[PDB]
Amino acid sequence: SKEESREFMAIFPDIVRDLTDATDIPEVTKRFAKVLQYNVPTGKKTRGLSTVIAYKMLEKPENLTPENVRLAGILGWCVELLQASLLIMDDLMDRSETRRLAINDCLHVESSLYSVLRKYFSHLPCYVPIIELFHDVNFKTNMGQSLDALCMKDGRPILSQFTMKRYSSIVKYKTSYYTFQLPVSLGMYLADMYDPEQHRQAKTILMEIGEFAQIQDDFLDAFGDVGTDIKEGKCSWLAVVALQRSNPAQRQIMEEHYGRPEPESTQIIKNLYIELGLPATFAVYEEESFNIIRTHIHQISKGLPHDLFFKIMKKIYKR
Amino acid sequence: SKEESREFMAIFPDIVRDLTDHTDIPEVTKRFAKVLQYNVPTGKKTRGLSTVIAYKMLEKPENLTPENVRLAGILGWCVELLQASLLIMDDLMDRSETRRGQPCWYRQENVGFLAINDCLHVESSLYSVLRKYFSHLPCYVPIIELFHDVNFKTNMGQSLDALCMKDGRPILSQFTMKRYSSIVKYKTSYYTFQLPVSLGMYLADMYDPEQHRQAKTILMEIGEFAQIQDDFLDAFGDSQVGTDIKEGKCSWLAVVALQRSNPAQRQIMEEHYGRPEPESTQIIKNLYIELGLPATFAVYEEESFNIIRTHIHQISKGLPHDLFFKIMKKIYKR
Ligand SMILES: CC(C)=CCC/C(C)=C/COP(=O)(O)OP(=O)(O)O
Ligand SMILES: CC(C)=CCC/C(C)=C/COP(=O)(O)OP(=O)(O)O
Ligand SMILES: [Mg+2]
Ligand SMILES: [Mg+2]
Ligand SMILES: [Mg+2]
Ligand SMILES: [Mg+2]
Ligand SMILES: [Mg+2]
Ligand SMILES: [Mg+2]
Ligand SMILES: [Mg+2]
Ligand SMILES: [Mg+2]
């Protein structure tokens, strides 16, 4: 929506002023403003806007005031502050050139979302549930990143670690919690929905959608119409399934050419992915997962709305 | 105190179990146990123990139960978790070889820049400890908010320190007493001195902002001497070794040197400060001797002690003077 996107983006200048003491240390406060301005507001803001959409579809229609929708927008920006911190750090860790300037900037940007929460939410019933959610998601996200790191040793991928169980765990902890669960749980808490069973049923569907989302992203990295997962030796769905299907000779090709800088080695891996019928395997998985997720959304109870979860599902599958 | 130290150290293994004992990912929880065991419990736990001591001197004697003193201990370990996360990061940022004898965590087999994740993880973990033990107590939200605020303030301090360096060379024009004082306050004094006392006050259900304000004033003054003394001893302490000069740090010695230096002496600092060659460290140390920095420190130690003691005598409301005198004595060693 034009109205939702514009109202959301209009909050950002306020967040910057809130976090930059708008003081005895103006030069470092001015620097932090530039850290936020470079790293937080550019690009799509899907997690932030999903927080507003979630609240709008969970809250009673009578309670949807401009004031409440703005609070949902502020929670959205706290998710985008978390996103920014993860993006700053991961790029240092993976020594990435581009995405789409100091080390402690990721700790600072992460820490800043709790100042925003304190400013706007400290007098509301949802305050402690929301801070505890952010605390738990950062802890779990770190466990995800560390599990991902345990698939690499001395710059070489550990292909024995490339199991579907470990992959599913990496996606859940590293990505799905903060990307899919966090926005919806935030929307629920702001709508004064605290029922554990409601959060649990939401979590189940969102982790399923999250897993397909990342598998699709992994697939498109190699087979989309420019991906470097193979070169970076990433624990990708393609690599995990390739090893499941591989005969000893196909396993040797992975062991020799996966996670190499030479463009020829990337091309060799893609050729093996084609030989192993990974495109067909993805098509089957996309159909099966869509039908299972559609079923689980139809089955959603505990007084949760289906349209929210269908909207999230549609955005990912694009049908 | 043997009993205090032993009681405090006995809590750590429970905290490791609280944070690592997520049954579907055993390898990462086992790794995190090791991250905590390497980085958190070894050497002096001065900040952690100071939290217990603060509480014991703030709380009503009748309320000092084994249970409450343990809660004070757990808050102290939350300070040590924050400490461990900061030192993990700072070592990567400064590319230091050792800290407290131990090789820096980032230098360990297959860590490097993954120390950023470990930094974030250890900092995050203290909030899990707070939830387990404090979620039901009135002090819960004030303590959570204090930890988040101190984290934010510490990051401002580290960034200000970083703005005294460019391309691995110190910016001597940035080495002013006003910027130095700000670095020490934000980077060190908040988490080292303010956080332990404020935690003790909150656990003793002391929420009066004016009490916290009066405490902060005194603790920032004691904190400033503590870092100046540490900076002095880096160059002039008996090793039986300080690398502040080699590292080109914004040290009290470097700041006061630049105040007292004639153009010729200013050129020695510009030429030799922050260089790796041992001869350059010798030249700076010799310039500090020439400029009479030892005498200058001796006068400051005497004058700051007297000024702070006066300020403690004038502390208002129901704050115990004895707590601030004990902190003073521990730092000045008199
Ligand atoms: C540091 C942490 C906790 C990250 C969690 C979320 C995240 C953005 C991971 C990086 O993805 P990736 O490195 O697998 O891929 P890419 O960098 O290509 O997005
Ligand atoms: C936000 C962060 C990461 C803050 C770091 C704070 C800190 C205690 C650093 C050490 O200071 P230093 O580097 O001047 O001294 P040393 O490393 O010698 O103790
Ligand atoms: Mg990564
Ligand atoms: Mg990456
Ligand atoms: Mg990438
Ligand atoms: Mg990808
Ligand atoms: Mg250092
Ligand atoms: Mg440093
Ligand atoms: Mg020192
Ligand atoms: Mg050092």
Numbering used by the authors:
A (entry chain B): 87 to 108, 112 to 189, 203 to 327, 334 to 427
B (entry chain A): 87 to 107, 111 to 329, 334 to 427
Pull verbatim passages from the article behind this deposition.
Here we characterize a metal-dependent, bifunctional isoprenyl diphosphate synthase from the leaf beetle Phaedon cochleariae by structural and functional analyses. Isoprenyl diphosphate synthase in P. cochleariae (PcIDS1, EC 2.5.1.1) produces FPP in the presence of Mg2+, but preferably forms GPP when exposed to the heavy metal ions (HMIs) Co2+ or Mn2+. Inter- and intramolecular cooperative effects in the homodimer strongly depend on the provided metal ions and regulate the biosynthetic flux of terpene precursors to either biological defence or physiological development. Strikingly, a unique chain length determination domain adapts to form geranyl or farnesyl pyrophosphate by altering enzyme symmetry and ligand affinity between both subunits.
Stabilized by cation–π interactions with R427, the F315 side chain positions IPPHAl for nucleophilic attack. V286 and I420 form the bottom of this specificity pocket and act as a molecular ruler, whereas F282 and F315 engage in π-stacking with both allyl groups.
